[PDB]
Ligand SMILES: Nc1ncnc2c1ncn2[C@@H]1O[C@H](COP(=O)(O)OP(=O)(O)O)[C@@H](O)[C@H]1O
Ligand SMILES: [Ca+2]
């Protein structure tokens with residue numbers, strides 16, 4: 001299990017999306033785009049496409065220490081997202097969890113049933129029609 | 141450079157390319173000729189099952205299956221494709237080493253990885269935490285996973301699945317006078333099982349309903365034109381999943397193995413496991429099995445417990461689909477054993493990279 005953590009941590013080092021994540025208090029958002037973790041522009045934070053899957057990293061100060069950093073990682077599943085986007089968001093959530101040493105707590109958010117912890121990240125939350133096309137190749 | 145995903149099932153091999161939404165090759169795990177070519181010349185050789193109850197037993201027949209997958213089904217050169225394989229939960233360390241040994245020395249794959257089947261189904265359902273009910277052809281499993289890591293000590297195993305359900309339907313179909321004996325007729329029983337069987341919400345009330353009227357009777361036309369009528373056998377067959385005593389097995393039903401598997405976990409995560417019962421395998425495809433599982437688990441869990449049964453429409457290939465998704469991620473393939481690392485360390489390296 002200690003060798004398992006070593007290879008899982010080394011694997012998380014090869015994702016450029018985590019470089020610089022969780023460095024300061026805030027909310028960082030990525031969207032799964034054809035099996036790839038793409039950062040969402042700051043101007044689009046809070047707007048989620050109903051057909052896509054996202055990763056939302058909430059860096060905050062825990063009640064036990066105001067000068068330290070805690071993490072709440074949420075992956076948000078749109079009502080029309082495909083199997084590839086939801087599955088990649090789930091795996092990459094665990095990957096970001098390992099990248100930050102297991103400290104983040106994982107939350108699964110689905111459209112319309114988001115937890116209060118996730119809704120509190122926005123003053124705010126707007127659902128948009130559409131979404132990026134699936135990365136799956138359809139087998140006839 | 142496309143990655144290969146091969147799901148080695150007890151009854152069916154699911155194989156294809158990473159990035160596809162469905163396996164391109166599905167054939168029985170039978171050796172004789174392999175698969176569809178062996179079921180034709182069946183009156184010449186003997187047909188053995190290399191993967192009984194999920195564990196590979198005979199490696200020479202497994203090598204023939206993998207050879208059939210690469211060259212005859214998918215028509216690919218194994219030397220030019222990183223290959224992701226699947227294994228049953230609680231797979232021994234030796235059986236994992238032999239998989240790596242055959243992949244590198246016999247087929248010369250550039251990279252290889254063996255993944256847990258139930259974990260792939262959970263990822264295919266868009267989840268990192270939950271308990272998977274994987275009921276295939278040879279074995280049924282209850283595998284809890286928390287935040288992407290399986291809990292091996294709570295895993296439940298039940299050597300009762302679709303193959304035994306096919307035979308039990310064959311048995312009870314004789315009560316009406318029908319006779320399914322030959323290997324070709326056993327495929328007709330499997331077709332009847334997959335088309336007309338369903339799980340009763342209340343078994344005893346459906347038994348009384350089948351004896352009260354003929355509203356539950358269904359007709360089925362055989363290939364030779366004979367039309368048969370089936371009654372309570374529709375729900376008596378999959379009932380074995382909840383009452384293994386129907387075939388003389390002194391074991392708990394799938395609802396109890398799920399409940400027990402949850403109780404072997406920390407109390408903090410049981411609340412999440414009850415709300416994330418993910419069904420996998422072709423034997424979980426019976427209509428009404430989710431409502432019945434919902435009813436049985438509710439009767440066992442505290443009254444305030446929120447319980448949810450997830451039945452993906454394509455859960456027949458959810459193991460392979462999850463493998464296709466994970467094999468499409470470069471960071472996941474980074475953990476795979478390359479041929480150079482195998483030539484240096486040997487076959488024991490599967491326990492040092494594959495989890
Ligand atoms: N619609 C269905 N209804 C009932 N049983 C089914 C259905 N589809 C497939 N099965 C059964 O599921 C089994 C195959 O499931 P699978 O997950 O491929 O098993 P394995 O992974 O062990 O090969 C077969 O025994 C088949 O009879
Ligand atoms: Ca999409």
Ligand SMILES: [Ca+2]
Pocket residue numbers: 097102103104105106287
């Ligand atoms: Ca964590």
Ligand SMILES: [Ca+2]
Pocket residue numbers: 148149150257276421459
């Ligand atoms: Ca299987």
Ligand code: NA
Pocket residue numbers: 165166167176
């Ligand atoms: Na086939």
